[PDB]
Amino acid sequence: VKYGIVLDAGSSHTNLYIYKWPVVQQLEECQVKGPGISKYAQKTDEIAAYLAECMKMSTERIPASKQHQTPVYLGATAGMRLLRMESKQSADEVLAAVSRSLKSYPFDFQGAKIITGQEEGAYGWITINYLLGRFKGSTFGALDLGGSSTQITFVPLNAPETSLQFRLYGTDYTVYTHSFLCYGKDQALWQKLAQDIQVSSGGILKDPCFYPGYKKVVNVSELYGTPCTKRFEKKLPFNQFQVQGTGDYEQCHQSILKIFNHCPYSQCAFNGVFLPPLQGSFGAFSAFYFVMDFFKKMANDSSQEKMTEITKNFCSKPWEEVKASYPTVKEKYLSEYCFSGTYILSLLLQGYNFTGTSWDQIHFMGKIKDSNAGWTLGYMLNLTNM
Amino acid sequence: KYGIVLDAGSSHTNLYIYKWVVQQLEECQVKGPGISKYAQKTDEIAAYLAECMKMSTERIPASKQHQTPVYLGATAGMRLLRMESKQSADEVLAAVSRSLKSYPFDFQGAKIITGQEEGAYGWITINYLLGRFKGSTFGALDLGGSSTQITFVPLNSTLEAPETSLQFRLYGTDYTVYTHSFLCYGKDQALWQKLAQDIQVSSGGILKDPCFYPGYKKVVNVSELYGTPCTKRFEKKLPFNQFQVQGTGDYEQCHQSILKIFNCPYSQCAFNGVFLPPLQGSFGAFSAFYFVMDFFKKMASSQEKMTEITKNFCSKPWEEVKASYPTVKEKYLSEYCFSGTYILSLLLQGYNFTGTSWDQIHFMGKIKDSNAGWTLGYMLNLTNM
Ligand SMILES: [Cl-]
Ligand SMILES: [Cl-]
Ligand SMILES: [Cl-]
Ligand SMILES: [Cl-]
Ligand SMILES: [Cl-]
Ligand SMILES: [Cl-]
Ligand SMILES: [Cl-]
Ligand SMILES: [Cl-]
Ligand SMILES: [Cl-]
Ligand code: NA
């Protein structure tokens, strides 16, 4: 039996996966407590301890004899793309600190790098299609959404810059992939606040994307701390402000549409980016999954008309009610949900154009065959040549 | 070694033969308009391409021929055709392919390149040719019938990061290049936008126009005018099949009326809500920037100067003008007042080359007996240099 370890260093979490193979399977997953590694830009010496728990789990989990032969990879995504954008130097320092830390365990260190969006979207499409056994025919589109970027990867029926050719089990595949940096659910929220905060705000932001009675305090330097808001930057007369929920789905939608900008093609995603016509089935995972899943589970674990209605209803539940109603859910997720859901609906319908007949062809999944839908398996695959 | 690239633009298809530093060996302009005009009559494509293709088989030694790659890259003319009919565009591309496939070269594809792939390659093309990769680089302004690109590195590094951005690692340097392509902002499509806008229902079937010389007349068919996606936003029910353009030959007013077919979340934009970073460093403007500005230059430097020259030229009656320049094709000559004024607004208001910035632009036809154009830049890619 063989083992491999891949760390998915995304902008909200670093997730470590252990794979094994006598078909390859996920043996275990570990979520590193804390945010993504880019938040370590100053305090890179703390990275070692940050990674310690998930790394110790792996040394306790893989037999000692198999350990020096076991490869270890870190692939970083949009969070780190943004950090690099801000400071090449910082991003490098973070990657090096990660490296020193992983190098020290008794595994075969294989590199820490920022993978491209074009790679990432590809690999996740591989992971899913592998997992469904759809490589044992015709295939599933891959929709990914994290804190910072969102990807879409699928095969259309017979704009080269954007495509990938790839031969896999005797078949040559042309796969459309694209990554919208700044369009993960969190960066969108930033974009939306930046844009909506006027100078006259008073340090108070009434917002329809959050529940009546929610309050959250937001720091201007953090908010302008990311490249995704450079475009809305103003010099502000206060060093922070407080978001106040008005919980109105209508308006929150309206206001979410504003962070997206005619199209030079047959049809587009948004921002002038080409999108081919929709084709076949899709699996929507990560934030897509977790968010939709929370809403689905108020619809007897349905349609776009019904999902929208569920969200409108939910967004108006006062905050105290929402908390009390879902007491076992982390306050940090629970608060995002009205925004996230509203956001996800728009991204799929106006964004990826999943309107009309197209809506039901999306199947939301966390795991296939007890293995996480993500890109790290795909990355694993190509990397092992298994 | 040799390679061939066809530049299928909206007015002309141009074939380039490169050989190898890489040099243009020869160029051939295919007679007729661009391939999109073949949408119905795709079987005619073969003969249309025949002259320039035979030239190449006569030109490259036979032994070198099977090893020689051949590419066709199509630009905004074909983007517009695809926008009207996916199917048509595909049929055109296929007909082109069957035709090219039949020659004894190494057929490497016929495709519509993106405005960014377009702005990219052209920017690469000039910097290669100016020996710039060794140092730092020049901006690229390209203008054609249907579209206009602008491509340059801003000081900022990443700032706006909107996907108006590329990476291009090139002989050891990773370059963050801003590039955009304004579809329908080529000189011709901008002309038709302007007519389309300014035509009033009441008109009688005559459009008085100040971008044309006193005494200029041209008859324009309404179904051609509305036949492009670019005047879609301007369509109106008109009580006539055609109308006549009549120059009143006034630059002031031409400028006025040109501005109107232009419309910003950002610190700054180009036009129409599209981001543009701060202008930075120097630029080579080419294709129609060069063929039009060079014409005016030859009636002499500075921008107030090129303005005075265009105001004056726009007043010369059409009979005078045609007599003054008898060796020029009436099809180009008749457009110059408009193009000059256009170019001047595009550079100054669009791209903000106002004041001080102006003199950073060097218009250029060709560097080292090689054309400014995307094609050579493509060529260096299509041999992973
Ligand atoms: Cl991160
Ligand atoms: Cl992400
Ligand atoms: Cl994020
Ligand atoms: Cl409350
Ligand atoms: Cl709960
Ligand atoms: Cl054409
Ligand atoms: Cl063009
Ligand atoms: Cl044109
Ligand atoms: Cl002459
Ligand atoms: Na859309």
From Swiss-Prot, chain B:
As for membrane topology, the entry says:
Multi-pass membrane protein
Query: What residue range is the signal peptide?
Result: none
Listed under catalytic activity are: a ribonucleoside 5'-triphosphate + 2 H2O = a ribonucleoside 5'-phosphate + 2 phosphate + 2 H(+); a ribonucleoside 5'-triphosphate + H2O = a ribonucleoside 5'-diphosphate + phosphate + H(+); a ribonucleoside 5'-diphosphate + H2O = a ribonucleoside 5'-phosphate + phosphate + H(+); ATP + 2 H2O = AMP + 2 phosphate + 2 H(+)
Identify the glycosylated residues. 156, 221, 263, 352, 381
Q: How is it modified after translation?
A: N-glycosylated. The N-terminus is blocked.
Q: Which GO annotations describe the biological process of this protein?
A: ADP catabolic process; cellular response to aluminum ion; cellular response to interferon-alpha; cellular response to lipopolysaccharide; cellular response to tumor necrosis factor; G protein-coupled receptor signaling pathway; negative regulation of ATP biosynthetic process; negative regulation of dopamine secretion
Per the UniProt entry, the Enzyme Commission number(s) are 3.6.1.5
One cellular-component annotation, GO: neuronal cell body
Tissue specificity statement from the Swiss-Prot or TrEMBL entry: Expressed in primary neurons and astrocytes, kidney, liver, muscle, thymus, lung and spleen.
Give me the ranges of the annotated region N-terminal lobe: 1-115
Positions of disulphide bridges: 28-52, 184-230, 211-254, 264-269, 314-337
Q: Which cofactors? A: Ca(2+); Mg(2+)
Question: Per UniProt, which keywords does this protein have?
Answer: ATP-binding, Calcium, Disulfide bond, Glycoprotein, Hydrolase, Magnesium, Membrane, Nucleotide-binding, Transmembrane, Transmembrane helix
Q: What does this protein do?
A: Catalyzes the hydrolysis of both di- and triphosphate nucleotides (NDPs and NTPs) and hydrolyze NTPs to nucleotide monophosphates (NMPs) in two distinct successive phosphate-releasing steps, with NDPs as intermediates and participates in the regulation of extracellular levels of nucleotides. By hydrolyzing proinflammatory ATP and platelet-activating ADP to AMP, it blocks platelet aggregation and supports blood flow.
Query: Subunit arrangement?
Result: Homodimer; disulfide-linked.
The protein in question is named: Ectonucleoside triphosphate diphosphohydrolase 1
Q: Which organism is it from?
A: Rattus norvegicus
Give the organism's phylogenetic lineage. Answer: Eukaryota, Metazoa, Chordata, Craniata, Vertebrata
